[PDB]
Design a protein around this motif. Structure first.
Motif, short mmCIF file in Angstrom:
data_model
loop_
_atom_site.label_atom_id
_atom_site.label_comp_id
_atom_site.label_asym_id
_atom_site.label_seq_id
_atom_site.Cartn_x
_atom_site.Cartn_y
_atom_site.Cartn_z
N UNK A 42 39.51 -2.09 -10.25
CA UNK A 42 39.13 -1.97 -11.67
C UNK A 42 40.22 -2.37 -12.67
N UNK A 46 39.70 -5.04 -15.65
CA UNK A 46 40.05 -4.80 -17.05
C UNK A 46 40.95 -5.91 -17.58
N UNK A 49 38.85 -9.29 -17.89
CA UNK A 49 37.81 -9.25 -18.91
C UNK A 49 38.39 -9.08 -20.32
N UNK A 50 39.37 -8.19 -20.48
CA UNK A 50 39.85 -7.81 -21.80
C UNK A 50 41.19 -8.42 -22.20
N UNK A 51 41.94 -9.02 -21.27
CA UNK A 51 43.17 -9.73 -21.62
C UNK A 51 43.05 -11.23 -21.39
N UNK A 149 28.62 -3.42 -29.90
CA UNK A 149 28.73 -1.96 -29.75
C UNK A 149 28.42 -1.21 -31.02
N UNK A 157 20.11 1.78 -31.08
CA UNK A 157 19.88 1.08 -29.80
C UNK A 157 18.45 0.56 -29.70
N UNK B 57 32.29 -8.22 -22.21
CA UNK B 57 33.17 -7.26 -22.86
C UNK B 57 32.40 -6.33 -23.78
N UNK B 60 30.16 -3.83 -21.70
CA UNK B 60 31.01 -2.83 -21.07
C UNK B 60 31.49 -1.83 -22.12
N UNK B 61 31.87 -2.32 -23.30
CA UNK B 61 32.25 -1.43 -24.40
C UNK B 61 31.09 -0.54 -24.81
N UNK B 62 29.89 -1.12 -24.96
CA UNK B 62 28.70 -0.33 -25.28
C UNK B 62 28.42 0.72 -24.20
N UNK B 125 34.99 2.46 -13.22
CA UNK B 125 35.00 2.39 -14.68
C UNK B 125 34.42 3.64 -15.34
N UNK B 130 39.63 4.89 -17.62
CA UNK B 130 39.08 3.55 -17.79
C UNK B 130 38.13 3.49 -18.99
N UNK B 134 38.76 0.81 -22.00
CA UNK B 134 37.77 -0.14 -22.49
C UNK B 134 37.67 -0.05 -24.01
N UNK B 137 40.84 -1.63 -25.63
CA UNK B 137 40.92 -3.08 -25.54
C UNK B 137 39.91 -3.75 -26.46
N UNK B 138 38.69 -3.23 -26.51
CA UNK B 138 37.68 -3.88 -27.33
C UNK B 138 37.88 -3.62 -28.81
N UNK B 196 45.17 4.82 -21.16
CA UNK B 196 45.24 3.42 -20.74
C UNK B 196 46.46 3.13 -19.88
#
Ligand SMILES: C/C(=C\Cc1c(O)c(C)c2c(c1O)C(=O)OC2)CC/C=C(\C)CCC(=O)O
Ligand SMILES: C/C(=C\Cc1c(O)c(C)c2c(c1O)C(=O)OC2)CC/C=C(\C)CCC(=O)O
Ligand SMILES: Nc1ncnc2c1ncn2[C@@H]1O[C@H](CSCC[C@H](N)C(=O)O)[C@@H](O)[C@H]1O
Ligand SMILES: Nc1ncnc2c1ncn2[C@@H]1O[C@H](CSCC[C@H](N)C(=O)O)[C@@H](O)[C@H]1O
Lengths: 395, 395
Positions: A42, A46, A49-51, A149, A157, B57, B60-62, B125, B130, B134, B137-138, B196
């Motif tokens: 994981x 991370x 995906x995020x960096x 988000x 939603x 991204x 995953x954030x949602x 996750x 984690x 997330x 990062x987002x 993190x």
């Protein structure tokens, strides 16, 4: 699936790719991504995906501002070192090398002995249409995804009810107008969009390619100039890249090729004496003016509209169709919801992020065509290609 | 390299991975990404980089807002269908299924017969650290990367001169204060950051693992309680995850373990009667108060600071070192600029995007340690691990 079994599946796809089987390239890519997902911990997911990916998108976007891929393309096999490239791009040498080294680590360009070299990918990204695709995606599309988000939390939603004005696009860009109206109001992104349409699926087999739709047997066989001298109308065909490909593949043409789009699209088509189509303005929300053509073709057009609007777009062809003669050719993604694939979910989320719309299942399309007055004849697909080709006719 | 040769290299790495060789997992992942890059046409690169990944991204954030990965973890092998999951998450069923199907296509969760199933990745996750990684990062890191094209165009493509207050972070978040000051002023992101730090490289071999740094031979052998009863000080060790791992691996400990960080970090450490370290407040910009310990350890600390500040951080250890006895253990990325790798460019761009700082080469670190009054004894690395372990001593 364990990594062991995925390694075997990957080896099997490599044999099919070496034997040049259809879709084997895409299958080999898919097995590689599955393999990565089966091995990554994981923290690596991370980081990637995020960096890695946000950094990669940003550098690629920055590259189009400093002409980087074009310079590496011109250097050919000699390449350029960081000092030469920093001097050409007007960048701090230290800053440039750090950004370039991330492109090397992401396999976009290569490096040997301190010299950077273009690749097939980076040389391809040097072309003007890919340059403008990159700017569009990073400046327009990226903020809309970033708003998902918070937008969906705020809206409870819910699927965008109106789609046009109540989606994440409007929230990301802080407007209350639709995406098409936003483009018209925000140069240069409308013309960037039009260049983008020739790039987003380029290099993939077209509907009219061998083993996909039988153009010769269904359209050219039985073409009747006494019914109409028009062979094919591309409704919403952008600057004409699809219809031009058609003409070059089936020349000498027995009838005319007619491109239909918005005036701002038609007016942006560069002059070409070898052009094999007639470029014409038409609004897909008015009745089709070209009567009794052998084929009416749409590619990625009603997928951007809600059900009521999609029905109108298809129904507006109906008064022009010659019974027993005119084919309707809908080139769209047909979502298989039991078998989700990146090429379909990609475009689905792009539709949500710009148009507040969605990709449709086969039962979805049949319902829309039936409400429009059309009936499906056959649906054609091709391994590894995102879109299908739905042939319809007068119900 | 052609795809043919990369397929062979991939098969060779799979054998090494089956034989459990060090770094073979990471090498197998790297060959897979090279394979993808050698097969993908530019339109697929555009779709993956600018559609799939930003959408991934965002979803995953949602997911961390609606408890999605936790629900799938609880369902275990039974899974949940879209209707059940939409009901649990409070989401429109149609909206949920479209987002979930993209996670399936990106290999984050799986799906069979309309039932969604958690995976090792998604179950991982689901953990709180984690989840907060997330969100950090987002919400914090992503906008900074998005600001790179426009920030560097505006600043003339220069490396941030001050680093602290003149970088892309300040522009993205529309502040003129440093990233550490921003965190203190913006709950809950400071405590998200602290969670993190236990996730960003979790699951990777640690410096003290077998075959990496010889802790027993260098530290425990020759430990002298008459010099000091302190075995190891972790300077800037966060909530203590690294120092706790050390203690569990080398118990019974011959001396004390001392964690040093900011008061807001120390005060956030949850109570634990089995804790093997003493949690203490210290400022890395003041002289080290623990005198003559057997080892002083730093992990990912001076890499976030410019040269002048990095020298001060290392120099502040010097008055505490017992000559011939105290080891300095610097756990940092050592950039090989002829061999660029994702694990090093990732962190480099993260440093640029938050601290306006950078990762350093071996010659860079030697210059900093020399200016601090230290000299390198040996540098240890491990296949597939981002960081090296630099052992230094009094010059
Ligand atoms: C179906 C439409 C967009 C829907 C769409 C796509 O069909 C494709 C392939 C892509 C995206 C997209 O939004 C995208 O972002 O990437 C590829 C119509 C958009 C309207 C105009 C440009 C007219 C403006 C005027 O009024 O003149
Ligand atoms: C070296 C620092 C950050 C540099 C950094 C990292 O060391 C790592 C591993 C990561 C990131 C990062 O920015 C990141 O974004 O992802 C991982 C110090 C940051 C200051 C404080 C939190 C103190 C606040 C107070 O004053 O109390
Ligand atoms: N009201 C309208 N009338 C005519 N064309 C329209 C329209 N609304 C959108 N379009 C056109 O529909 C196209 C959708 S994008 C697809 C372009 C092209 N068929 C391709 O797949 O590459 C754009 O070219 C856009 O200008
Ligand atoms: N002035 C200062 N004094 C003490 N600690 C500081 C500091 N400035 C930053 N730090 C700490 O330095 C750490 C950098 S992040 C690295 C955390 C941990 N060593 C790990 O690698 O997982 C954070 O814990 C932060 O709180």
């Amino acid at each position: 699936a364990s990594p062991a079994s995925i390694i075997q599946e990957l080896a099997s796809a490599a044999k099919q790719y070496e034997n040049n089987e259809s879709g084997a390239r895409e299958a080999l890519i898919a097995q590689s991504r599955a393999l990565i997902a089966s091995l990554e911990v994981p923290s690596e997911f991370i980081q990637h995906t995020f960096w890695s990916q946000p950094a990669l998108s940003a550098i690629v976007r920055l590259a189009t501002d400093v002409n980087l891929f074009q310079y590496l393309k011109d250097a050919q096999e000699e390449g350029l070192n960081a000092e030469a490239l920093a001097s050409k791009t007007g960048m701090d040498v230290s800053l440039f090398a750090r950004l370039a080294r991330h492109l090397v680590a992401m396999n976009v360009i290569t490096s040997r002995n301190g010299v950077f070299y273009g690749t097939a990918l980076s040389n391809g990204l040097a072309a003007e249409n890919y340059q403008q695709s990159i700017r569009f995606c990073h400046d327009v599309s990226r903020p809309s995804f970033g708003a998902f988000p918070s937008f969906f939390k705020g809206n409870g939603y819910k699927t965008p009810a109106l789609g046009t004005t109540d989606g994440p696009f409007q929230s990301a860009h802080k407007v209350d107008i639709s995406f098409p109206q936003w483009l018209v109001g925000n140069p240069p992104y409308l013309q960037y969009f039009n260049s983008y349409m020739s790039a987003y699926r380029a290099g993939k087999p077209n509907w009219c390619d061998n083993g996909f739709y039988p153009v010769a047997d269904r359209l050219l066989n039985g073409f009747d100039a006494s019914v109409s001298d028009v062979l094919l109308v591309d409704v919403g065909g952008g600057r004409g890249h699809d219809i031009a490909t058609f003409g070059s593949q089936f020349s000498p043409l027995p009838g005319r090729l007619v491109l239909q789009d918005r005036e701002q699209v038609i007016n942006s088509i560069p002059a070409d004496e070898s052009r094999q189509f007639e470029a014409t303005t038409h609004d897909i929300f008015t009745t089709q003016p070209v009567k009794h053509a052998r084929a009416y073709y749409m590619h990625s057009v009603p997928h951007g509209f809600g059900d009521e609007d999609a029905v109108k777009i298809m129904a507006n062809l109906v008064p022009a169709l010659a019974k027993g003669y005119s084919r309707v050719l809908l080139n769209e993604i047909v979502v298989d919801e039991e078998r989700p694939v990146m090429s379909a979910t990609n475009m689905d989320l792009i539709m949500l992020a710009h148009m507040g719309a969605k990709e449709r299942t086969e039962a979805d399309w049949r319902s829309i065509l039936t409400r429009a007055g059309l009936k499906v004849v056959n649906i054609y697909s091709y391994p590894g290609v995102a879109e299908s080709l739905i042939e319809a006719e007068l119900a």
